[PDB]
């Protein structure tokens with residue numbers, strides 16, 4: 001039993017809710033919140049900008065030190081950093097950004113990072129400003145992640161479409 005509330009169960013291990021991931025993280029304080037990161041960990045907008053703003057820019061400060069030490073992530077890759085006031089840990093995962101021309105096949109590699117964590121609160125990778133089709137992202141999630149994932153979808157209209165079209 002865990003503390004996630006109001007989710008629709010899609011599969012054995014995937015759950016979905018119309019929610020603001022920032023507000024959901026603030027309430028649940030999950031072990032892991034996933035950030036929709038880019039390779040530079042520049043958290044300017046979308047989910048990343050919202051998560052970083054909620055940490056009062058502490059996420060960005062920590063991220064800048066990470067990059068100065070380690071260099072950029074790979075598209076499809078991830079790193080574990082602090083969850084600050086939102087979660088124990090933040091798993092920064094880089095999905096391909098279609099608006100940069102990145103290969104959508106890398107979306108499966110991106111979701112594989114979730115399998116290193118037993119339970120996660122996450123957004124749909126490569127959705128929103130990353131330019132992928134969220135219906136496709138949900139399909140890849142369900143077909144790739146085997147650990148327990150609670151998906152937060154900000155837009156109510158999109159949430160209803162994702163549920164109604166789910167096979």
Ligand SMILES: COC(=O)C[C@H]1CN(c2ncnc3[nH]c4cc(F)ccc4c23)CCO1
Nearest residue numbers: 021046047050123127128129152153154155
């Ligand atoms: C348009 O709706 C989509 O297609 C998906 C969007 C929105 N993203 C989010 N997902 C879950 N919670 C979210 N809180 C946020 C707060 C913000 F200031 C910005 C984005 C999000 C956000 C996912 C990727 O892009």
